[PDB]
């Protein structure tokens, strides 16, 4: 027994390529499309709920997840790898930040922590890189709204809007045409729905689409009253119904 | 491509673990051994090849006891069998220390099962080169089991493994049909001796020595004991007689 794989499984090839990272990126390319758009007063991230069978309950599988009350994430690639990354991300937000400063981490720093976790699966002994790309959206007092992308290599970059996965090339092009620095959240939601429609083959509705936003504080989602400074989470997942109402004005 | 059979925990394209399958070959190349479940106990018997006149008779015991109520016999790489019984004993001691009661056969079966299965999980270890037949009596009856190198096991009415496993299985199947009400410990012992003699034809070249043990609620008080002296000869004769 005992893990005796203490050497790297990702190494440099004569051409300078890191094979395992390139291959992980290829797995990301085969994944269902997901995207994110940053507005002036919010951020939207969305993807398609590619149910693997009509007998499956697509709601019991969340592709969009809350990391902190003001930060959410979505991905493209290997769903199981994403799931554990979310568990680790939620935990590191506490162990490396909340239990020290008594407040949730700003978006860039949490992204930085996730990125570190992914980089390590690129050099540590006995493991393969995570086969996913993430789109993390959030808000924090001193930086406002932000959107980031994290790749299998651990690299991450901020975006105004972007797409990853299957038809990311076409979707990125469609976003470059409609994006401007004056967009309001509802506008971005609208643009998000339009972009996603080109990537979807079959049914396109609130039950096959998963979408969340980072907007204003939702005092009704807090759970208690009595403390003025505590106004609620900015992260909110739209309901199947909220999505349909917007599809009619498509 | 190929090479799927060079490392222990690798799945081949058809979902198999070739190293475990090769371990099975070591088992089939071994001496034959069996187990018979009777109406209130179990009987174990094994073929002991006589390599030469030099082997002191009755001295190289192959059947082993675990705790005081379990018997274990195996075919294949003998050292691997002992290794497995050593673990079985630690497993039994651990269970008794914590729960006081001696370990139930089904519980013991899974203990050996999980350990054997564990050796098919990594390439840093090799699978066990033996198939094991074991059992005994507990709070609710007699139990007979057979465990393969894959860690696979089930409860049995009768079981056999090794060189003459086919002959043995054919004989065991007849018994099961002609005795739906259940065989008696005394009968099972003789029947066991017979089956081994018949299964010896798949190795008739070398001479052999018979070994039997049993565990019966009425005949041994539920404790594992070896069949010796008179009861042994009486069984050897019963077999020598029906071999002609």
């Amino acid at each position: 027994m005992t893990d005796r794989y203490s050497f790297s499984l990702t190494t440099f090839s004569p051409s300078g390529k890191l094979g395992q990272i390139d291959y992980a990126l290829t797995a990301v390319k085969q994944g269902v499309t997901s995207l994110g758009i940053k507005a002036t007063n919010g951020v939207v991230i969305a993807t398609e709920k590619k149910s693997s069978s009509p007998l499956a309950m697509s709601e019991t599988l969340s592709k969009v997840s809350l990391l902190t009350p003001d930060i959410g994430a979505v991905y493209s690639g290997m769903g199981p790898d994403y799931r554990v990354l979310v568990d680790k991300s939620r935990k590191v937000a506490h162990t490396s930040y909340k239990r020290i400063y008594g407040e949730y981490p700003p978006t860039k720093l949490l992204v930085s922590e996730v990125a570190k976790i992914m980089q390590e699966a690129t050099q540590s002994g006995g493991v393969r890189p995570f086969g996913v790309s993430l789109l993390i959206a959030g808000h924090d007092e001193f930086n406002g709204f932000s959107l980031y992308q994290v790749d299998p290599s651990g690299s991450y970059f901020p975006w105004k809007a972007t797409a990853i996965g299957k038809g990311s090339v076409a979707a990125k092009t469609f976003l470059e045409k409609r994006w401007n620095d004056e967009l309001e959240l509802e506008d971005a939601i609208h643009i998000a729905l339009l972009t996603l429609k080109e990537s979807v083959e079959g049914e396109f509705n609130g039950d096959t689409i998963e979408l969340a936003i980072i907007g204003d504080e939702n005092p009704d989602l807090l759970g208690y009253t009595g403390i003025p400074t505590d106004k609620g989470p900015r992260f909110r997942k739209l309901t199947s119904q909220e999505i349909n109402d917007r599809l009619e004005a498509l | 491509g190929t090479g799927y059979d060079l490392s222990n925990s690798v799945f081949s394209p058809d979902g198999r673990n070739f190293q475990v399958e090769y371990a099975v070959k070591a088992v089939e190349n071994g001496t034959t051994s069996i187990g018979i479940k009777c109406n209130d106990g179990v009987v174990f018997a094994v073929e002991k090849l006589i390599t030469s006149k030099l082997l002191v008779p009755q001295k190289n015991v192959k059947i082993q006891v675990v705790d005081r109520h379990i018997g274990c016999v195996y075919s294949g790489l003998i050292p691997d069998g002992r290794h497995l019984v050593n673990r079985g004993r630690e497993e039994a001691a651990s269970f008794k220390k914590l729960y006081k009661t001696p370990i139930p056969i089904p519980a013991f079966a899974d203990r050996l099962g999980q350990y054997v299965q564990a050796h098919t999980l990594y390439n840093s270890v090799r699978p066990f080169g033996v198939s094991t037949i074991f059992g005994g009596v507990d709070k609710n009856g007699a139990h007979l089991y057979m465990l393969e190198p894959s860690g696979s096991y089930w409860g049995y009415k009768g079981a056999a493994t090794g060189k003459g496993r086919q002959s043995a299985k054919a004989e065991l199947e007849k018994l099961v049909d002609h005795h739906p009400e259940g065989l008696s410990a005394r009968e099972a012992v003789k029947q066991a001796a017979k089956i081994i003699y018949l299964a010896h034809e798949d190795n008739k070249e070398k001479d052999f020595e018979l070994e039997i043990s049993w565990c019966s609620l009425s005949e041994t008080n539920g404790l594992h004991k070896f069949v010796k002296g008179d009861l042994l000869q009486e069984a050897i004769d019963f077999a020598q007689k029906e071999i002609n």
């Binding site: 291959y23 309950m57 790898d81 006995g126 | 799945f11 979902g15 049909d177």
Partner: protein
């Protein structure tokens, strides 16, 4: 290079062959199982095949009682199946100890799926060649079915099927639900839900069953149990007086 097919590292196409081959191992037993949700119960049915006459039929099972409330049926070789069952039992017992309440079906499923994901990422551990279907009547979610595979994937189902002829059962079930328009069997007794399940099992596989060709597990509020050959015969008799 060609070793990207022996351990769990990516292939140039971003694939994990060892995981795909582990999926192959799940059909080695040539058994089919299915699960359906009642109004207030959950049923799992699985074929039972005992070829050898020397085997004690009572010890041949692929259904496991994980906890007082959770049941698990496995598709794959029995040793990997027992490995999963032992771990699941331990995880369920530990959860109750640490958090003070019974581990939910979907939570145990996630936990087992995460464990599987790890074998998928760490080289020294191999994937288990099995698919696990967990069932129960959760105190918050009601009747539940959650299934995990060697890729670390898991999801909840209205009903599901696993095995060599998985597809035939699945489409049969899909057709029934497109018709009824509801996500469960509208029956008050678990007995009738078991009958529905066996009935559709027969239609899809095109085979008849005796009391020893099946294995059944039922989940009710606060308890999961398996049927005896006789409880099954009683079920087979009732379905016979309808056809």
């Amino acid at each position: 290079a060609g070793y990207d097919r022996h351990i769990t590292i990516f292939s140039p196409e971003g694939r994990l062959y060892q995981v795909e081959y582990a999926f192959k191992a799940t059909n080695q037993t040539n058994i089919n199982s299915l699960a359906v949700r009642g109004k207030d119960c959950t049923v799992v049915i699985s074929q039972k095949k005992v070829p050898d006459k020397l085997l004690d039929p009572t010890t041949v099972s692929y259904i496991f009682c994980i906890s007082r409330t959770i049941g698990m049926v496995v598709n794959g070789p029995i040793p990997d199946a027992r490995n999963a069952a032992l771990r699941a039992k331990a995880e369920a017992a530990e959860f109750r100890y640490k958090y003070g309440y019974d581990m939910p079906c979907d939570v145990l499923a996630k936990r087992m799926a995460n464990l599987s994901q790890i074998y998928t990422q760490r080289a020294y551990m191999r994937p288990l060649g099995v698919i696990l279907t967990f069932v129960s009547v959760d105190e918050e979610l009601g009747p539940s079915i959650y299934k995990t595979d060697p890729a670390g994937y898991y999801v909840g189902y209205k009903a599901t099927a696993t095995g060599p002829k998985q597809q035939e059962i699945t489409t049969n079930l899909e057709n029934h639900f497109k018709k009824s328009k509801i996500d469960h069997i509208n029956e008050e007794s678990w007995e009738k839900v078991v009958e529905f399940a066996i009935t559709h099992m027969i239609d899809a596989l095109g085979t008849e069953f005796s009391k020893n060709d099946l294995e059944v597990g039922v989940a009710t509020k606060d308890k999961f149990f398996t049927l005896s050959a006789e409880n099954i015969e009683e079920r087979l008799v009732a379905i016979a007086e309808q056809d």
